[PDB]
Ligand binder design. Sequence first.
Ligand SMILES: CCCCCCCCCCCCCCCCCC(=O)OC[C@H](COP(=O)([O-])OCC[N+](C)(C)C)OC(=O)CCCCCCCCCCCCCCCCC
Ligand SMILES: CC(C)CCC[C@H](C)[C@H]1CC[C@H]2[C@H]3CC=C4C[C@@H](OC(=O)CCC(=O)O)CC[C@@]4(C)[C@@H]3CC[C@@]12C
Ligand SMILES: CC(C)CCC[C@H](C)[C@H]1CC[C@H]2[C@H]3CC=C4C[C@@H](OC(=O)CCC(=O)O)CC[C@@]4(C)[C@@H]3CC[C@@]12C
Ligand SMILES: CC(C)CCC[C@H](C)[C@H]1CC[C@H]2[C@H]3CC=C4C[C@@H](OC(=O)CCC(=O)O)CC[C@@]4(C)[C@@H]3CC[C@@]12C
Ligand SMILES: CC(C)CCC[C@H](C)[C@H]1CC[C@H]2[C@H]3CC=C4C[C@@H](OC(=O)CCC(=O)O)CC[C@@]4(C)[C@@H]3CC[C@@]12C
Ligand SMILES: CC(C)CCC[C@H](C)[C@H]1CC[C@H]2[C@H]3CC=C4C[C@@H](OC(=O)CCC(=O)O)CC[C@@]4(C)[C@@H]3CC[C@@]12C
Ligand SMILES: CC(C)CCC[C@H](C)[C@H]1CC[C@H]2[C@H]3CC=C4C[C@@H](OC(=O)CCC(=O)O)CC[C@@]4(C)[C@@H]3CC[C@@]12C
Ligand SMILES: *[C@@H]1O[C@H](CO)[C@@H](O[C@@H]2O[C@H](CO)[C@@H](O)[C@H](O)[C@H]2NC(C)=O)[C@H](O)[C@H]1NC(C)=O
Ligand SMILES: *[C@@H]1O[C@H](CO)[C@@H](O)[C@H](O)[C@H]1NC(C)=O
Ligand SMILES: [Mg+2]
Ligand code: NA
Ligand code: NA
Ligand code: NA
Ligand code: NA
Lengths: 976, 32, 294
Amino acid sequence: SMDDHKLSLDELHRKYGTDLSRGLTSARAAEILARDGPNALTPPPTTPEWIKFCRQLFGGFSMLLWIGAILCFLAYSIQAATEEEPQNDNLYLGVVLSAVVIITGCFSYYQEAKSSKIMESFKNMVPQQALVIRNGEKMSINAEEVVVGDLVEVKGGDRIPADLRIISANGCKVDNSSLTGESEPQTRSPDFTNENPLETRNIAFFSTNCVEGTARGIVVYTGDRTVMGRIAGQTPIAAEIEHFIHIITGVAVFLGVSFFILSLILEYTWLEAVIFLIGIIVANVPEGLLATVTVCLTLTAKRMARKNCLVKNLEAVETLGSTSTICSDKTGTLTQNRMTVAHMWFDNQIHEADTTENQSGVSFDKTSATWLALSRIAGLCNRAVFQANQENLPILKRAVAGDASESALLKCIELCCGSVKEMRERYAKIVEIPFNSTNKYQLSIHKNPNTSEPQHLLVMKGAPERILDRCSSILLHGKEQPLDEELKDAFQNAYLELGGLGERVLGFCHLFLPDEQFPEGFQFDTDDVNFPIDNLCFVGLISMIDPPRAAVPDAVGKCRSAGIKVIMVTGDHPITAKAIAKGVGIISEGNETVEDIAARLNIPVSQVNPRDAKACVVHGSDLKDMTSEQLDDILKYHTEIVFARTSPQQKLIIVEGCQRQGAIVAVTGDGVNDSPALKKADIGVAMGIAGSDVSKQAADMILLDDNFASIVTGVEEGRLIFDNLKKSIAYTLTSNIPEITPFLIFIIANIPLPLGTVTILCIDLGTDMVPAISLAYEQAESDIMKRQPRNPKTDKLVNERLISMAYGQIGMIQALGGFFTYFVILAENGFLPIHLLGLRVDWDDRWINDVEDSYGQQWTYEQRKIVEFTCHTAFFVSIVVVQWADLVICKTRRNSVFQQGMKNKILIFGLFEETALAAFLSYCPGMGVALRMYPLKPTWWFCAFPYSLLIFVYDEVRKLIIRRRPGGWVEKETYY
Amino acid sequence: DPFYYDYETVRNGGLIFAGLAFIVGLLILLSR
Amino acid sequence: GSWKKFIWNSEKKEFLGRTGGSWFKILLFYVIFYGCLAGIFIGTIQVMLLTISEFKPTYQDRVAPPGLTQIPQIQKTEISFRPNDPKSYEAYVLNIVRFLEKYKDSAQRDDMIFEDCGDVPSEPKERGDFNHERGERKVCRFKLEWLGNCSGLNDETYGYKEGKPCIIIKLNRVLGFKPKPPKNESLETYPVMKYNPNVLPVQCTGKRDEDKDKVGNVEYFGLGNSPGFPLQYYPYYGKLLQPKYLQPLLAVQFTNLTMDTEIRIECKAYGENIGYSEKDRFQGRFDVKIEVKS
Ligand SMILES: CCCCCCCCCCCCCCCCCC(=O)OC[C@H](COP(=O)([O-])OCC[N+](C)(C)C)OC(=O)CCCCCCCCCCCCCCCCC
Ligand SMILES: CC(C)CCC[C@H](C)[C@H]1CC[C@H]2[C@H]3CC=C4C[C@@H](OC(=O)CCC(=O)O)CC[C@@]4(C)[C@@H]3CC[C@@]12C
Ligand SMILES: CC(C)CCC[C@H](C)[C@H]1CC[C@H]2[C@H]3CC=C4C[C@@H](OC(=O)CCC(=O)O)CC[C@@]4(C)[C@@H]3CC[C@@]12C
Ligand SMILES: CC(C)CCC[C@H](C)[C@H]1CC[C@H]2[C@H]3CC=C4C[C@@H](OC(=O)CCC(=O)O)CC[C@@]4(C)[C@@H]3CC[C@@]12C
Ligand SMILES: CC(C)CCC[C@H](C)[C@H]1CC[C@H]2[C@H]3CC=C4C[C@@H](OC(=O)CCC(=O)O)CC[C@@]4(C)[C@@H]3CC[C@@]12C
Ligand SMILES: CC(C)CCC[C@H](C)[C@H]1CC[C@H]2[C@H]3CC=C4C[C@@H](OC(=O)CCC(=O)O)CC[C@@]4(C)[C@@H]3CC[C@@]12C
Ligand SMILES: CC(C)CCC[C@H](C)[C@H]1CC[C@H]2[C@H]3CC=C4C[C@@H](OC(=O)CCC(=O)O)CC[C@@]4(C)[C@@H]3CC[C@@]12C
Ligand SMILES: *[C@@H]1O[C@H](CO)[C@@H](O[C@@H]2O[C@H](CO)[C@@H](O)[C@H](O)[C@H]2NC(C)=O)[C@H](O)[C@H]1NC(C)=O
Ligand SMILES: *[C@@H]1O[C@H](CO)[C@@H](O)[C@H](O)[C@H]1NC(C)=O
Ligand SMILES: [Mg+2]
Ligand code: NA
Ligand code: NA
Ligand code: NA
Ligand code: NA
């Protein structure tokens, strides 16, 4: 429909609730909140909470265990009609195969719903903020409640929160890429230019940003009724677990089909063969890994939010842990960006600031016209103003509306030389200049209040090396002593002795223009430059100290021990950047640049071999003319690189240069010029308290505390998930040999069967469901930040060393621990072990009711099948007993369990749930006819204690050899 | 009698152990 | 894995991605590893065999009331034959002849092993104790002539040639077991037969109600005149102490079977020790289906 862009501001009075200034109103706010819908775009409804349940109950690899129950109930339904004495045995088989599906589907749905509930809790974690100008006095609000008739003020880098009509802008430029497809900013103005209401300048749009400038606009639509409100993934660590599950599925399907047609030769009663096939396929395929990976990801994301490191998608979790390069900025991230004045220099003497109450009187609060003029220059250039409720607050804290340097400068002026706003109205600012990035020239021409001098003053401040050509004549005692060469040498010495401790310096110069250029009447403008700028009245230098953050100098050491390379990209002088890098530990001691060894041996810099210097400080002006080959070996031959005097716009040329060597680069940005460099890096980090919305729509992280050390803690939490996934995969695969081998030795050796299909499903449901997911909650070992970064090209999760440990070494001990208990039971009832070789044909014969044992007595058919089902029960129980030691050794990878501790509460619950399920399935009245499971003697629970102890002893001695001998044969062959 | 072996005592002990090992796991899990 | 490039290099000599001095170590590791695993398994088995006696099993409660079986070893508890067809009943006669080899009178002549227990039923004979202090124990000898009209001293087809077939019933051996016949309250067991205090009684009747009208007459042959197992034997001492032990037998003949009908017959044994089951249809009891085609 037609939007109110054609009608001007008078009809904007006469279209909304009478407000174009001073805010709208409280009452009106509630009324237009109740009239229209709030600013939330309404979500599409997803599938309800029973379709997600039937996709897990009747899903993949559970239809097999449903059709097994259907066939069992069909065989019982056939038998109950055309047979007398119907003998309901397939009824309980169908009941058991139906109960296994319900339990496994309920566990899978619970583990899916918990991770969905956690990952849904990151929206409204860092909501949106809109700047309105309500009756109050300019406030930020939750942005999902604004109304039609508000006036909002946006600036460079903010998000437009509603449908806007612009009233007063200073060249804001919206990027029209969400509804047109243009990658070019467009100028906005309150006029009426285009006939089409969409490609015009009258209005602004939802889900857009007006980069530069500011704007004051009025809301026309909110919520669903905007032009955006109408109209309308995998993980590289999940797409590998899928590919592994497909290969294990093919192997298990081959094994189950091969075991299916091998049983029918042994007269195995077609229902039993089908149930045996289904039980092999279901139990030998690790379907519960695909849940575990999600629980490994989402939980980790939650912990990253508890340490001020917020992710934007789950694909950014597994790539943050493989980070090999961090290219961070200096101001705001490494340092606090709360600077105070220290160590001014004027009249060939470094002074002290004397910030505190201990007034050393350092030639201050007195009469000496050089520092009076210097403090007057540093007082009438500070654009920052103070807020209300501050003039009765001490020096120790002050709210102030401005950037860092001028807020630092206002401290010394409001401390030393009275109030400040009286000094602003004394010398009237007649033309201002905003702070430019090209020459860094802050100027504000002033005039006398009534009279102070016949030559009224013009001011100049900025970088001292960028004003050394402009202002040269010093102010010793009011005297403009001209350019002097040893004085420039002393200025250079002051520059090195003020940048050498790590301070940003600012120069100060001024002018006494006569009345020849402006009289007392009409003044002169500064946009048309008719002022002499060369050989001006320099007064002195002011520097400011900037403390680095709290937990940074050991976070850089943890980045160094973990093989991550840190790059510092600042916009400061290349001697202060070297000082800050040596202060925080970027350039550690022992490492030096070519300037240091050149000034060491007193050979000039230009002929030093650039191979003995591993640290390097690159000026930003040389970055523009160097081609790709010089950058691609600056980043190759050095180890500690610091880019100084560098614009953020050329950050991108760094990042690709680090990506060609092969690296996962993490880049911090907070501006609108960094957004080409954020989404070219492998992981982009936005800032949380500073940083506009364009900077955080392009990044994969949010730093909620603006600290560098939170990135390092995020690298820890990202590194943890590969360890936890390898531990869970290693635990899950060990229970495959004791489920395969009892049927193999049944065929080969012709002994009675040690394990049936019901106890195979019991083994799988008991020892694979709960304790395999408890290794996702495992704490971090002591050597996660002492290993190198993993390469996601040559380092997969599964190796030939992970398969040959689970299938070849640990699984065989569990198979032997089961077979021992089988032989112990069958030898204590009368069948000695040599007598069992060859007994299978007579044992399984229903019409041979006198089978002789080693003592000579004669067994019935049911009397020996009861002993066989007791052997099945204790096979399952001994598998649970060795599962214990399999779960205990599979929670560490190179540390011992005595230096890891039992801090995992889910693992102890897994052990107790295992043992409670085993002791309940054996000793409950009623399991003898349903499950065919019979009670064990109390001394049969200790038959697989030595094999469970052997697993523990073997794995502890193996890990000890790996720790005390790195790079040996045991680490090369067994360390998975 | 070498032919009897009452199973009720070991069944009572096993069910007591199952109830104990279930409630202690419940108290370890819900300890948070 | 790719193809040739991975099957062999000969610029590093790496068959399957592993050099030949590395294939030797990874196989020596698995040979030593499985050798020590086999050693530990054999050692635990040999240690467990030291707690096992060689005269008495550790647990006897899973054979505790014995089964009751019949000697023509048949395939679905079914006997079916034609008397004027000497190829239908030949397997049954061959089974009975192969079973009654060791019961012959010429196979019991060794008087230092076999002994002459009485020809009337008597009390159990304790041979001592399970302690090997007397060596091998002697065994009572069973004469075939007590199975008369069912032994091989006559009709050598055991009745199958002339209509009326005959089975041989025996109770399963349990080491150390002494059967207790029921008491004599004259109300206790069912229904009525001749009672003897040293005979475990057996009775074979028809199963359904139409089978009781068709089974006809049933003859028993054993030691004495009360049908059942004598008690002079028992309790089996085991095949270490008593090789060539001979369990007592009981022959049952069906002299007046009804022709061309399938008849179900249940044989039960009575006593205090003897108990029955509902799933085990061979414990203390059995059943047979006979069908004499004409
Ligand atoms: C009741 C509890 C008892 C528990 C007992 C459990 C025993 C624990 C055994 C587990 C250890 C597993 C590795 C053992 C092999 C150690 C090899 C070694 O030391 O490397 C030397 C060294 C390590 O030092 P290196 O290799 O790095 O030397 C470096 C050389 N320079 C410096 C020049 C580079 O490796 C070798 O060079 C040669 C090793 C060849 C290995 C050949 C295979 C040996 C066969 C081992 C059989 C052990 C099986 C026993 C398991 C039985 C348990 C069921
Ligand atoms: C009697 C037969 C037919 C089954 C009857 C239904 C099942 C008892 C249902 C009820 C709730 C289901 C499950 C839903 C919750 C899980 C949480 C699980 O605990 C954990 O996962 C560890 C703690 C944690 O994950 O934080 C243990 C019980 C279990 C498997 C439940 C087991 C029983 C399920 C399959
Ligand atoms: C490890 C898994 C995959 C297989 C382990 C079981 C074995 C495959 C089978 C083969 C024959 C079995 C047993 C049959 C014979 C006995 C006799 C036993 O004692 C003796 O050897 C004494 C012999 C004598 O004195 O006459 C030692 C070996 C043992 C336990 C064998 C051990 C190996 C068994 C269980
Ligand atoms: C079936 C059994 C025989 C094998 C599986 C059980 C383990 C072999 C045993 C060996 C000793 C037991 C535990 C006894 C108590 C210690 C305390 C623990 O030490 C600490 O608590 C240190 C805490 C910290 O440093 O943070 C080291 C492991 C642990 C749990 C042991 C882990 C392994 C246990 C369960
Ligand atoms: C049947 C019984 C008599 C066999 C004896 C069992 C052994 C005493 C087991 C118990 C646990 C095993 C080991 C597993 C735990 C480690 C912790 C380890 O202590 C450390 O922290 C090592 C630190 C380092 O080396 O840097 C030294 C002892 C050791 C090898 C243990 C030594 C004793 C082992 C071989
Ligand atoms: C990994 C380390 C810390 C061992 C942890 C394993 C289990 C959590 C704990 C629970 C109590 C322990 C056992 C203490 C003794 C009982 C005897 C048994 O019950 C009987 O004695 C037979 C029945 C009866 O006595 O009547 C049930 C299992 C068992 C082995 C327990 C199960 C497993 C243990 C080692
Ligand atoms: C990981 C594997 C190697 C462990 C399997 C257990 C044992 C380590 C292996 C070694 C060889 C296997 C068996 C191969 C076949 C022989 C037959 C047997 O010889 C006989 O006397 C049987 C013939 C007869 O006398 O009636 C002696 C032991 C036995 C079971 C071996 C017992 C031990 C086995 C199971
Ligand atoms: C055992 O078999 C013999 C013959 O083999 C039976 O003896 C005959 O029985 C019939 C039955 O009426 C008599 O008429 C004959 O006179 C008997 N002959 C002889 C020589 O005795 C004998 O009855 C059978 N024993 C039984 C059935 O208990
Ligand atoms: C078999 O013969 C006996 C003769 O004593 C007779 O009583 C019985 O009814 C007969 N049975 C049949 C089935 O003919
Ligand atoms: Mg930044
Ligand atoms: Na599974
Ligand atoms: Na991005
Ligand atoms: Na397992
Ligand atoms: Na498994």
